[PDB]
Subunit: 71 residues, 3 copies
């Protein structure tokens, strides 16, 4: 193993720690961003049953008119 | 007189390694939590095609009763 | 006699930073895989309203 002077190691280790710290900050923000996308998607999913019933009810209101259009 | 710089830098170094190691632990835990929530929503999304088909065919099944009433 | 505290402290600190850096690489790899999975689910859910409309247009057409 090759040691550096105290001053060189002070400079190098502090810069490498700061690099890791910046990487960690970027990762934490990614995780936050992904949580936000996740909640938005869950909100959409939660609304789907309401959307199916609207169309379901919408169809059966156009029904007598569909027999009329037919003939 | 005893100089203190060298020892103090050793101390602050291991403390800062520890501070970042703790951030890593928190991030890893949050990634595990996201993973669990993603699997949960994925299972739920997996039942949605069936949900639409079940509504498509159920409408399909309420025509006889409907048309008899209309012509009545 | 050669003192060794400094050189042992340097070697251990470097190695420990290496251990944390490998933890980070493992997290990035896992998050990359998860991001894709989440994007795929978001894409499918985003198209579901269109599928509902297709189902109600099919009803009207099929009879």
């Amino acid at each position: 193993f090759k040691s550096m002077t105290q001053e060189a190691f002070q400079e190098s280790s502090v810069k490498e720690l700061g690099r890791l710290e910046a990487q960690l900050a970027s990762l934490r923000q990614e995780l936050a961003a992904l949580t936000l996308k996740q909640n938005s998607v869950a909100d959409e999913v939660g609304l789907l049953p309401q959307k199916i019933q609207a169309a379901r009810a919408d169809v059966e209101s156009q029904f007598p008119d569909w027999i009329r259009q037919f003939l």
